[PDB]
Amino acid sequence: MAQDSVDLSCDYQFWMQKLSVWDQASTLETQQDTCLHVAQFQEFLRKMYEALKEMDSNTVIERFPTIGQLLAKACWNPFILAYDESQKILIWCLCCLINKEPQNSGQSKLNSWIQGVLSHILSALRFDKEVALFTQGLGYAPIDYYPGLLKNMVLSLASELRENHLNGFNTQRRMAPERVASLSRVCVPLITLTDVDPLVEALLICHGREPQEILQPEFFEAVNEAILLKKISLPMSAVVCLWLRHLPSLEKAMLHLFEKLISSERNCLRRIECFIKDSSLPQAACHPAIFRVVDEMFRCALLETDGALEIIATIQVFTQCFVEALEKASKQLRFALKTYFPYTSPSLAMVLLQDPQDIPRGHWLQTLKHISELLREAVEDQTHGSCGGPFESWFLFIHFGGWAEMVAEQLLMSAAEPPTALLWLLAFYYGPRDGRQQRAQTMVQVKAVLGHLLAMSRSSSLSAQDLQTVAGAPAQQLIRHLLLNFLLWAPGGHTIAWDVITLMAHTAEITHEIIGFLDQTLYRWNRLGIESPRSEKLARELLKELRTQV
Amino acid sequence: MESLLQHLDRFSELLAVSSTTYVSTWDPATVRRALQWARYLRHIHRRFGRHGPIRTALERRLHNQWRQEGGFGRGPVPGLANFQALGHCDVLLSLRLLENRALGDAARYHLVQQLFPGPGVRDADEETLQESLARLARRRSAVHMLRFNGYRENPNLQEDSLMKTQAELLLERLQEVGKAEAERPARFLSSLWERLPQNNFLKVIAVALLQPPLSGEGSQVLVHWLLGNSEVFAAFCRALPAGLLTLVTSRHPALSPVYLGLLTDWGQRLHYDLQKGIWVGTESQDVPWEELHNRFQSLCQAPPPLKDKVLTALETCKAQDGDFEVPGLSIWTDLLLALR
Amino acid sequence: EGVEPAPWAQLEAPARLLLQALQAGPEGARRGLGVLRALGSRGWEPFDWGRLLEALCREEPVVQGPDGRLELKPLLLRLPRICQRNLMSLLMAVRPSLPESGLLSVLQIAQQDLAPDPDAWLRALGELLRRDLGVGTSMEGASPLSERCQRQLQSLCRGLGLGGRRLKSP
Amino acid sequence: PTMLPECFFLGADHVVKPLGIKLSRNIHLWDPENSVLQNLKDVLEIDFPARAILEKSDFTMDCGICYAYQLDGTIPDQVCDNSQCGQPFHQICLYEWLRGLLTSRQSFNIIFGECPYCSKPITLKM
Ligand SMILES: [Zn+2]
Ligand SMILES: [Zn+2]
Known part of the structure; x- marks a missing residue:
């Protein structure tokens, strides 16, 4: 509550000096620059509409000088008039500048000119003469055939493009590259007007035989934006071609995942899974190129955070959609996993692909004990003819959710004489790049903590300070997460979980971290169908109440 | 059923005279009556528009009205062309009343505010008149732009x-x-x-x-x-x-x-x-x-x-x-x- | 007036058939694999790929840019841009069984040094093919992605409380 | 070599499902001190056929463009008039293909031009 006039009064002169440049957008440059600035033009028009709406017309002369010329320039420009609600807003602006009882000559002239310009948007025959004459002859209003006219205009151009497409290197009429670029420029502003969407999908499939791209990326980015905000729903073949010809669109869309796990829906993995399955990523990641690009952005995020549980979770989900999409659309002719997963043994992947839905609850300890063996072979015996290093075999181990998480929950079940292999496995997960020295230290710390915890479980339901003792470094997240597993698993929990939660919630980061832990765990159980309903309800309750505290 | 006859012929009269330059007496009452009649017609189009004898009866009324006029002598009036023009009859009237120069000042103000209430009713299940005009304007531009950029x-x-x-x-x-x-x-x-x-x-x-x-x-x-x-x-x-x-x-x-x-x-x-x-x-x-x-x-x-x-x-x-x-x-x- | 021959006109039948195939939208890639199994089947079992990877560098002139500019183009930037991306995807998958000498003639082109409007993908598949050989770690920050990507992504994961793992080894 | 490969099965969804389950269950009993066959036989708990048919083993009876049987109802129908190719196709795939070639010419409902695999005259009647 300060400026009100000033920023808009500056941007006014900017836009009026810009509209005069464009001037009915009959040329290439006027169109491309209109295509860009239109949206900010729309927001300008929102602020402008608020200002003109709250106040009244013919009375005030605030920006009334050349508002008329702005709205003329606007409306006779059709790329303006085509955008979401810019028309609707221009209508509203004009309805603000109308007068009920015009008093001086000027007000009546104004209002007539206002009806004129509305009639020019809506109901003007700026179209081929013979069709006007013929229709007027048949006694039709534009209103009652425009739709079918448009529909026929589109199906024509879409057909044309499909024959351009099929006549690849044939002595026959080659649709003019200029004209294809022309159409593409016109797809942008009315992408969310349903009577083009066949045209679009024809443009994206029908690439043709050029070394050069023909389409201008303002096309690709208009389309990308509209896919992600769900204003378009093409078929999936459309959007694999989109990705596979404009890299910054496929960046722009895997980054629009990242906003979803960061801001909106932190640890609502149902919501994240549903966004990934509705986005077409899985099916488009069946093409090995797009898999490799996507997992590069995943790798860049694994490093910015040093192994953030929230990105680990999104990988686990995404990979599960991808793996189900591979299986599905890979009968004949599929690319071999050293193609998607090139920087590891294909051996290791082929183990880690086998899901725990298809193995019994009892034989999972065996599976993990096999994984520990082959990972230790790859990491400790880091010789020629292998993975490049330990980090790579870890970034693989992430891409399987299930296996990395289940280790703690299986250690508690075998806490009496813990297997050394599991201690290796878990230590590796919470810490790569340590030296054998540091892994053995971590393992024996966890072994002592297993002793204390098994004593505490075989005892009655005890305090929270006894756990705070062992809680009191490089191995903290390991112990925290293992401890929470203990709370949820043992029936000695459901009583003293809150009692440890309150203390362990030093910061908000710990709170969010454990919440992510618990969401991952619920998603994991409800998938794998393994449950004690106590633990399920307890996790839900705790998660519900702690998401309010933050 | 017979109730609909006197409604539709009266609206057809008003629609034809929509274009005509006598408008001094007309007011908010005429306009509101017009649009609510048109909503009634558009609502019938939705309710019992398919697989009815009332359907075929209204087309008999249409065609016999459209042949007694002919396109000869008194008015070469387009008219609402078919039963599907029932679904956007409101739109016809509204477009034509903008085009009517003789439209009196305060009636035009009440008109335009009744057609364009604003974003006060942004939430509607029913495709209201504002959104209907939207899609028109968009298409109209759409067809100019294709014709002049990639049509052959x-x-x-x-x-x-x-x-x-x-x-x-x-x-x-x-x-x-x-x-x-x-x-x-x-x-x-x-x-x-x-x-x-x-x-x-x-x-x-x-x-x-x-x-x-x-x-x-x-x-x-x-x-x-x-x-x-x-x-x-x-x-x-x-x-x-x-x-x-x-x-x-x-x-x-x-x-x-x-x-x-x-x-x-x-x-x-x-x-x-x-x-x-x-x-x-x-x-x-x-x-x-x-x-x-x-x-x-x-x-x-x-x-x-x-x-x-x-x-x-x-x-x-x-x-x-x-x-x-x-x-x-x-x-x-x-x-x-x-x-x- | 506007008849043009296909730029693989003058090639050995099987590679002609491979490259004819990869033309075919995003199912180009698999078609390609299918193509090779259905050439292992036929009389000339071997694919002398370095016949093709020579062929992929071989230049001819084109006249584009202003109405007056002679340029020399290799094959790789001449045949259809969808064949480019589908090719490199097929090479990833077949990387082991290629002679390195010919293969690095491709990547030289691919890297797309000192060109305006480069093939975003091809550049990227350069980087992705070099990481898979093990000669072009390159000692840059040389990743497939844009600076814009990598920047925005560091800028957003900055809004997440970093994990206690140790993955960087200073 | 002796170590575990990336592997998977083609055939009947009702026949293959049990083998996949059994494989996922015995896959920890892979051993790189045996042979590949001596691991596969006792992991999948089976013996193999040593050429159950050596003459009519299989001829790939797929489109030879898209390499599918069942493209939208259509079958591998259109073939080569050649002893050395014989390769089936689809109506759709072969039309899209031949329209594109410079060697093709179209009469009323006929397309003449070269079989993709062998480059011999092949005719398509829509
Ligand atoms: Zn086919
Ligand atoms: Zn043949």
Whole structure:
């Protein structure tokens, strides 16, 4: 509550000096620059509409000088008039500048000119003469055939493009590259007007035989934006071609995942899974190129955070959609996993692909004990003819959710004489790049903590300070997460979980971290169908109440 | 059911007088009454619009109203064109009342605020009048922009958008009058032919004979119309390009022997000069050797059920005019030769 | 007036058939694999790929840019841009069984040094093919992605409380 | 080599499902001190056929463009008039293919031009 006039009064002169440049957008440059600035033009028009709406017309002369010329320039420009609600807003602006009882000559002239310009948007025959004459002859209003006219205009151009497409290197009429670029420029502003969407999908499939791209990326980015905000729903073949010809669109869309796990829906993995399955990523990641690009952005995020549980979770989900999409659309002719997963043994992947839905609850300890063996072979015996290093075999181990998480929950079940292999496995997960020295230290710390915890479980339901003792470094997240597993698993929990939660919630980061832990765990159980309903309800309750505290 | 008659005819009166320049007395009351009547009609379109005798009864009322008016004498009024124009009758009225210059000031203010309430009702399940006008304006721009950026006049008129479209407009309007059976379609088409631009019209009919059937009654009416009027068919066959009329023939064997008749008689009214080794006509309006060659050219590069026909019509006109085996002599010898 | 021959006109039948195939939208890639199994089947079992990877560098002139500019283009930037991306995807998958000498002639082109409007993908598949050979770690920050990507992504994961793992080894 | 490969099965969804389950259950009993066959036989708990048919083993009876049986109802129908190719195709795939070639010419409902695999005259009647 300060400026009100000033920023808009500056941007006014900017836009009026810009509209005069464009001037009915009959040329290439006027169109491309209109295509860009239109949206900010729309927001300008929102602020402008608020200002003109709250106040009244013919009375005030605030920006009334050349508002008329702005709205003329606007409306006779059709790329303006085509955008979401810019028309609707221009209508509203004009309805603000109308007068009920015009008093001086000027007000009546104004209002007539206002009806004129509305009639020019809506109901003007700026179209081929013979069709006007013929229709007027048949006694039709534009209103009652425009739709079918448009529909026929589109199906024509879409057909044309499909024959351009099929006549690849044939002595026959080659649709003019200029004209294809022309159409593409016109797809942008009315992408969310349903009577083009066949045209679009024809443009994206029908690439043709050029070394050069023909389409201008303002096309690709208009389309990308509209896919992600769900204003378009093409078929999936459309959007694999989109990705596979404009890299910054496929960046722009895997980054629009990242906003979803960061801001909106932190640890609502149902919501994240549903966004990934509705986005077409899985099916488009069946093409090995797009898999490799996507997992590069995943790798860049694994490093910015040093192994953030929230990105680990999104990988686990995404990979599960991808793996189900591979299986599905890979009968004949599929690319071999050293193609998607090139920087590891294909051996290791082929183990880690086998899901725990298809193995019994009892034989999972065996599976993990096999994984520990082959990972230790790859990491400790880091010789020629292998993975490049330990980090790579870890970034693989992430891409399987299930296996990395289940280790703690299986250690508690075998806490009496813990297997050394599991201690290796878990230590590796919470810490790569340590030296054998540091892994053995971590393992024996966890072994002592297993002793204390098994004593505490075989005892009655005890305090929270006894756990705070062992809680009191490089191995903290390991112990925290293992401890929470203990709370949820043992029936000695459901009583003293809150009692440890309150203390362990030093910061908000710990709170969010454990919440992510618990969401991952619920998603994991409800998938794998393994449950004690106590633990399920307890996790839900705790998660519900702690998401309010933050 | 009979309740709807007095409602719809009254609204049809108001719609026709929407365009008319008497507007001094009209007010918010007239406007609000109009739009709520139109909502009632649009609501019926939704409720009991399909599979009803009331449906067919309203179309009887429409067509008999649209034929007592005709498009002749008192007003060439478009009118609401069909039962689907029920679904956007409000829109017609509203668009036309903007176009009405005589619209009084305060009525226009109440009007425009009743049509364009604002984003105060942004949340609506029902496609309201503001959103309806939206989609229109968008499409209108949409069609300008495509026409002027990537539209091309297809050679093969049958596959042009506009010819295809205008054809299918005509065929809706013919099917209505066919079922109505009040006047013969012959009368309608003859009057069309006289009233509007002929060059456009012919091309369209042409394109209409080729669209596959949609509900071939349409094509079966127009062929009988054309055989009924030879004189228009003389300008039809003269005005178009060759391939169009050729695929016309392989579709309708009923036009073949008359069309070959037309040129057969156009061939015979030339004369060959020895100075320029070329057939030519006497008058300015006599078809060239090249346009005639063209048309028979196309008819030969066609299906077998026309090839034999054209071949034998030329052989029988060769024998008739001396069975010479040299040029200078028979237009028809010239052709047969020119083909190899 | 506007007849053009296909730029693989003058090639050995099987590679002609491979490259004809990869033309075919995003199912180009698999088609390609299918193509090779259905050439292992036929009389000339071996694919002398370095016949093709020579062929992929071999230049000819084109005249584009202003109405007057002679340029020399290799094959790789001449045949259809969808064949480019589908090719490199097929090479990833077949990397082991290629001679390195010919293969690095491709990547030289691919890296797309000192060109305006480069093939975003091809550049990227350079980087992705070099990481898979093990000669072009390159000692840059040389990742497939844009600076814009990598920047925005560091800028957003900055809004997440970093994990206690140790993955960087200073 | 002797170590575990990336592997998977083609055939009947009802026949293959049990083998996949059994494989996922015995896959920890892979051993790189045996042979590949001596691991596969006792992991999948089976013996193999040593050429159950050596003559009519399989001829790939797929499109040879798209390499699918069942493209939208359509079957591998259109073939080569050649003893050395014989390769089936689809109506759709072969039309899209031949339209594109410079060697192709189209009569009324006929397309003449070269079989993709062997470059011999092949005819397509739509
Ligand atoms: Zn096929
Ligand atoms: Zn063949």
